[PDB]
Write an enzyme that holds these catalytic residues in place. Structure first.
Site, PDB file in Angstrom:
ATOM      1  N   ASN A  70       0.842  -1.196   0.000  1.00 41.89           N
ATOM      2  CA  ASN A  70       0.000   0.000   0.000  1.00 41.89           C
ATOM      3  C   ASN A  70       0.878   1.246   0.000  1.00 41.89           C
ATOM      4  O   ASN A  70       1.444   1.615   1.029  1.00 41.89           O
ATOM      5  CB  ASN A  70      -0.915  -0.009   1.219  1.00 41.89           C
ATOM      6  CG  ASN A  70      -1.829   1.196   1.266  1.00 41.89           C
ATOM      7  OD1 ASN A  70      -1.923   1.967   0.307  1.00 41.89           O
ATOM      8  ND2 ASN A  70      -2.529   1.355   2.383  1.00 41.89           N
ATOM      9  N   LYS A 104      -0.023   4.224  -0.207  1.00 41.22           N
ATOM     10  CA  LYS A 104      -0.749   5.372   0.348  1.00 41.22           C
ATOM     11  C   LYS A 104      -0.586   6.578  -0.579  1.00 41.22           C
ATOM     12  O   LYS A 104      -0.455   6.402  -1.793  1.00 41.22           O
ATOM     13  CB  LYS A 104      -0.367   5.630   1.813  1.00 41.22           C
ATOM     14  CG  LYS A 104      -0.493   4.356   2.662  1.00 41.22           C
ATOM     15  CD  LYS A 104      -0.345   4.628   4.141  1.00 41.22           C
ATOM     16  CE  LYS A 104      -0.484   3.361   4.958  1.00 41.22           C
ATOM     17  NZ  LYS A 104      -0.399   3.659   6.431  1.00 41.22           N
ATOM     18  N   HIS A 143      -9.784   0.647   4.625  1.00 46.62           N
ATOM     19  CA  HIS A 143      -8.551   0.951   5.338  1.00 46.62           C
ATOM     20  C   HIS A 143      -8.870   1.883   6.508  1.00 46.62           C
ATOM     21  O   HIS A 143      -9.715   2.777   6.376  1.00 46.62           O
ATOM     22  CB  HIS A 143      -7.543   1.601   4.394  1.00 46.62           C
ATOM     23  CG  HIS A 143      -6.169   1.651   4.957  1.00 46.62           C
ATOM     24  ND1 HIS A 143      -5.761   2.626   5.847  1.00 46.62           N
ATOM     25  CD2 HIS A 143      -5.113   0.823   4.783  1.00 46.62           C
ATOM     26  CE1 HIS A 143      -4.508   2.388   6.197  1.00 46.62           C
ATOM     27  NE2 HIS A 143      -4.093   1.304   5.564  1.00 46.62           N
ATOM     28  N   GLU A 147      -7.473   4.426   7.606  1.00 44.45           N
ATOM     29  CA  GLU A 147      -7.356   5.849   7.277  1.00 44.45           C
ATOM     30  C   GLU A 147      -8.642   6.351   6.616  1.00 44.45           C
ATOM     31  O   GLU A 147      -9.074   7.472   6.875  1.00 44.45           O
ATOM     32  CB  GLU A 147      -6.115   6.106   6.401  1.00 44.45           C
ATOM     33  CG  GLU A 147      -4.841   5.920   7.209  1.00 44.45           C
ATOM     34  CD  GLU A 147      -3.603   5.556   6.405  1.00 44.45           C
ATOM     35  OE1 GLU A 147      -3.610   5.628   5.151  1.00 44.45           O
ATOM     36  OE2 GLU A 147      -2.594   5.187   7.053  1.00 44.45           O
ATOM     37  N   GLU A 206      -5.562  -4.871  10.504  1.00 44.97           N
ATOM     38  CA  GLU A 206      -4.730  -3.741  10.922  1.00 44.97           C
ATOM     39  C   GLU A 206      -4.816  -3.617  12.432  1.00 44.97           C
ATOM     40  O   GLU A 206      -5.872  -3.231  12.945  1.00 44.97           O
ATOM     41  CB  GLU A 206      -5.261  -2.429  10.348  1.00 44.97           C
ATOM     42  CG  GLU A 206      -5.303  -2.275   8.856  1.00 44.97           C
ATOM     43  CD  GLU A 206      -5.825  -0.892   8.491  1.00 44.97           C
ATOM     44  OE1 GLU A 206      -7.022  -0.785   8.167  1.00 44.97           O
ATOM     45  OE2 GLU A 206      -5.065   0.105   8.592  1.00 44.97           O
ATOM     46  N   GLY A 249       1.004   4.212  16.400  1.00 45.09           N
ATOM     47  CA  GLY A 249       1.303   5.462  17.099  1.00 45.09           C
ATOM     48  C   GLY A 249       0.933   5.472  18.571  1.00 45.09           C
ATOM     49  O   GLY A 249       0.772   6.539  19.172  1.00 45.09           O
ATOM     50  N   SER A 265       2.822  -3.076  11.173  1.00 44.25           N
ATOM     51  CA  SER A 265       4.178  -2.722  10.768  1.00 44.25           C
ATOM     52  C   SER A 265       4.965  -3.974  10.373  1.00 44.25           C
ATOM     53  O   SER A 265       5.149  -4.885  11.186  1.00 44.25           O
ATOM     54  CB  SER A 265       4.873  -1.980  11.909  1.00 44.25           C
ATOM     55  OG  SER A 265       6.177  -1.597  11.526  1.00 44.25           O
TER      56      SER A 265
END
Lengths: 256, 255
Positions: free
Chosen positions: B8, B10, B98, B100, B170, B176, B216
């Site tokens: 991906n 992005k 996704h 996001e 995911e 984060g 990740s």
């Protein structure tokens, strides 16, 4: 005088083969002489842009092109989103920001549109900043004030010279799926007020250079009356933009 | 199940950067690996024509896909891209749901399910993304929450259609937050995903569906992750932008 601009918003229509065919049909159908008197742009889906770039650059076409949206960001972790940097590298001249369909389906607000307009300008693109009032507001007799607030919000934070680098499009949203029809006089009332406000936000000299387009229903039967108005500088065209002969005819009428 | 490594990109890379990245991957990955791993790149919409012509013109074994699509086939949806356009450009995959897009663009499970169905109508393989937040993980309710999100994101699909999707997990709770998802964490959720797919179809059909890890992924962890029984590869983030690094992930997954 401001040179008229006919910009065709293809919306979510036409694959890359169809894009190539349509651009070639427009180029075939519109006599060269008209480009001296009207600017003509096509606004395809993102996936068609490279194809259009190849034709425009390879045939040295006088038509220009643009995209239908962009991210407020330059790059990064925004899956599905397209950057103004990519559009600039594809040779786009324009990008539409704040189209009523994105305000409806994607909840875009004036502040987001203003941020998108600034990002567009950062990448050397001309944003086409779309505004326009809905049926209830129109019915209240608020033809101007609501549009002026939306213009102020959608250009918030832009410097005067940045305002001189945008195009505004007025969409009479009150005439979409309601049965209402917006006249050329209706377009003139709003576009004149838009220009007067631009003179305040920027300067009188700058406002006299900004192209203000009509973004309601534009076709062969009404385009002449629309562009004839003192403060209307062209059209952000919908469905007619998908037919190359019809679109060429619109440009020819706007020119002559 | 043949593993899948899907990159991906992005919102990164213009169209001639896209060509160079694809060529870097093709340069870096020995041809022998393609029999053992499927490798896909997922560029921005504006890079698809460039990638399609390179992949088709040079008969590359890499495949490609897109990062989103509209739930509709065509019409008055300014700014949106149709699965019909993606199909005509030879895309094999399209990412739907996704994290996001769920967060920045207000996509709920129902919209994800509609996009998944539309992807299938255009002959695209949707990569349906799910994943839970830290509060859910901390409460120990991560398995159940993922199963409910899976069910909602696949709503309307029947047994035969289940076999045509890919799922990506995911671990959003590890994005984060400082926390690190282990191979064991990936396995726990991916096993539960396959169990639900079996209920929506059958164990046999579920055993054909690739379930990817979408956290990740790097050269030091990809082996442990793909080694897990119910993890079939990766939906790779940042590493997908480095052709060498991405090829390395594919080679490891191939085994």
């Amino acid at each position: 005088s401001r040179k008229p601009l006919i910009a065709g918003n293809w919306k979510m229509n036409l694959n890359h083969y169809e894009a190539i065919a349509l651009v070639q049909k427009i180029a075939f159908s519109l006599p060269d002489k008209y480009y001296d008197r009207v600017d003509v742009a096509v606004i395809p889906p993102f996936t068609d842009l490279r194809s259009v770039q190849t034709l425009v650059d390879g045939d040295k076409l006088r038509l220009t092109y643009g995209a239908q949206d962009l991210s407020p960001h330059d790059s990064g972790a925004y899956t599905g989103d397209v950057s103004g940097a990519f559009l600039a590298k594809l040779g786009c001249s324009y990008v539409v920001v704040g189209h009523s369909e994105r305000r409806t389906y994607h909840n875009e607000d004036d502040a987001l549109v203003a941020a998108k307009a600034a990002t567009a300008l950062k990448h050397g693109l001309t944003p086409i900043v779309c505004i326009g009032e809905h049926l209830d507001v129109r019915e209240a007799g608020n033809h101007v004030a609501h549009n002026i607030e939306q213009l102020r919000g959608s250009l918030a934070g832009l410097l005067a010279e940045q305002i001189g680098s945008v195009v505004i499009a007025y969409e009479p949203v009150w005439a979409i799926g309601t049965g209402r029809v917006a006249s050329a006089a209706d377009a003139q009332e709003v576009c004149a007020a838009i220009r007067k406000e631009l003179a305040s936000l920027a300067s009188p000299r700058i406002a006299d250079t900004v192209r203000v387009l009509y973004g309601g229903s534009v076709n062969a039967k009404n385009v002449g009356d629309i562009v004839a108005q003192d403060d209307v500088d062209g059209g952000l065209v919908g469905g007619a933009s998908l037919d190359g002969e019809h679109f060429a005819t619109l440009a020819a009428i706007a020119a002559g």
